Scaffold this active site. Structure first.
Site, PDB file in Angstrom:
ATOM      1  N   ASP A  82       0.751  -1.247   0.000  1.00 16.25           N
ATOM      2  CA  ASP A  82       0.000   0.000   0.000  1.00 16.25           C
ATOM      3  C   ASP A  82       0.780   1.294   0.000  1.00 16.25           C
ATOM      4  OD1 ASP A  82      -2.013   1.912   0.492  1.00 16.25           O
ATOM      5  OD2 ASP A  82      -2.568   1.066   2.429  1.00 16.25           O
ATOM      6  N   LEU A 126      -1.190   8.830  -4.836  1.00 20.03           N
ATOM      7  CA  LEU A 126      -1.374   7.633  -5.718  1.00 20.03           C
ATOM      8  C   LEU A 126      -1.315   6.452  -4.719  1.00 20.03           C
ATOM      9  CD1 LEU A 126       1.241   8.854  -8.248  1.00 20.03           C
ATOM     10  CD2 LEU A 126      -1.207   9.049  -8.391  1.00 20.03           C
ATOM     11  N   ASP A 127      -2.474   5.821  -4.655  1.00 19.84           N
ATOM     12  CA  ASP A 127      -2.681   4.819  -3.620  1.00 19.84           C
ATOM     13  C   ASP A 127      -3.058   3.422  -4.055  1.00 19.84           C
ATOM     14  OD1 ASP A 127      -3.385   3.599  -1.177  1.00 19.84           O
ATOM     15  OD2 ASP A 127      -5.009   5.001  -0.761  1.00 19.84           O
ATOM     16  N   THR A 128      -2.023   2.568  -4.064  1.00 19.52           N
ATOM     17  CA  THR A 128      -2.294   1.184  -4.530  1.00 19.52           C
ATOM     18  C   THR A 128      -3.199   0.438  -3.550  1.00 19.52           C
ATOM     19  OG1 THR A 128      -0.331   0.409  -3.482  1.00 19.52           O
ATOM     20  CG2 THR A 128      -0.114   1.081  -5.752  1.00 19.52           C
ATOM     21  N   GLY A 129      -3.340   0.854  -2.314  1.00 19.71           N
ATOM     22  CA  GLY A 129      -4.225   0.274  -1.301  1.00 19.71           C
ATOM     23  C   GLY A 129      -5.634   0.786  -1.454  1.00 19.71           C
TER      24      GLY A 129
END
Ligand SMILES: CC[C@H](NC(=O)C[C@H](O)[C@H](CC(C)C)NC(=O)[C@@H](NC(=O)[C@H](Cc1cccc2ccccc12)NC(C)=O)C(C)C)C(=O)N[C@@H](Cc1cccc2ccccc12)C(N)=O
Lengths: 104, 104
Positions: A25, B24-27
């Site tokens: 994350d 920018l939030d991959t979670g």
């Protein structure tokens, strides 16, 4: 390995010798193990009281605990927070240590 | 550009012709504009009632709104949620559209 973000970017890491599926994350400043996961660890170190974390729904209390993480042939010795959150997340602190990068 | 995660991965994108700094939030499964940002947009489309999102602190109510996002020479036309969250986040839905990738 490259995650294209079609699905949540998850991977198995060993924490205190216990393989756990974790979320990678980039939106998390720090890593947090769920309480459920902390209770299943094969080995646990001491609990240090923490001063919470915040997210979309407000703030949540945390404690910190020493852990050893193994992945990508690295052996990382650090502290991770513990909290009643829905999934265990590896945030920027550990992501930086493992060499992860986000490319736009 | 490559974000090494020493700092939060933020960038400026144009949403409805308004430059905004976004995380920018991959979670994040989906993208959410803060209410403060939605109110500063130069143009706004209709508000559709949504069914919330969850995070570390519980659930929060949302509404959805049509937006045009410009970045990396792409013109993306989609819906984004709106909620009283601390920062505007671009989640996997828009990240996938822009071609972002996380490499471990
Ligand atoms: C401790 C982590 C914290 N970051 C964060 O909460 C941001 C981080 O990306 C988090 C991970 C998620 C897994 C908790 N994402 C979200 O909350 C996003 N949720 C979803 O996608 C859910 C996922 C989700 C929900 C429920 C159960 C799940 C089970 C498994 C997997 C995902 C799950 N989908 C939905 C549809 O409800 C939202 C942004 C769209 C953080 O960095 N806190 C900082 C700074 C800060 C303070 C106050 C509010 C903040 C809000 C956002 C980011 C940072 C914030 C700190 N220093 O304490």
């Amino acid at each position: 390995v490259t995650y294209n973000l079609e699905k949540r970017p998850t991977t198995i890491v060993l924490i205190n010798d216990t393989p756990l599926n974790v979320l990678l994350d980039t939106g998390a400043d720090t890593s947090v193990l769920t309480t459920a996961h902390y209770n299943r660890l094969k080995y646990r170190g001491r609990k240090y009281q923490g001063t919470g974390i915040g997210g979309v729904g407000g703030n949540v209390e945390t404690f910190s605990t020493p852990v050893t993480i193994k992945k990508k042939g690295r052996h990382i010795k650090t502290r991770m927070l513990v909290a009643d959150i829905p999934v265990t997340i590896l945030g920027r602190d550990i992501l930086q240590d493992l060499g992860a990068k986000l490319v736009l």
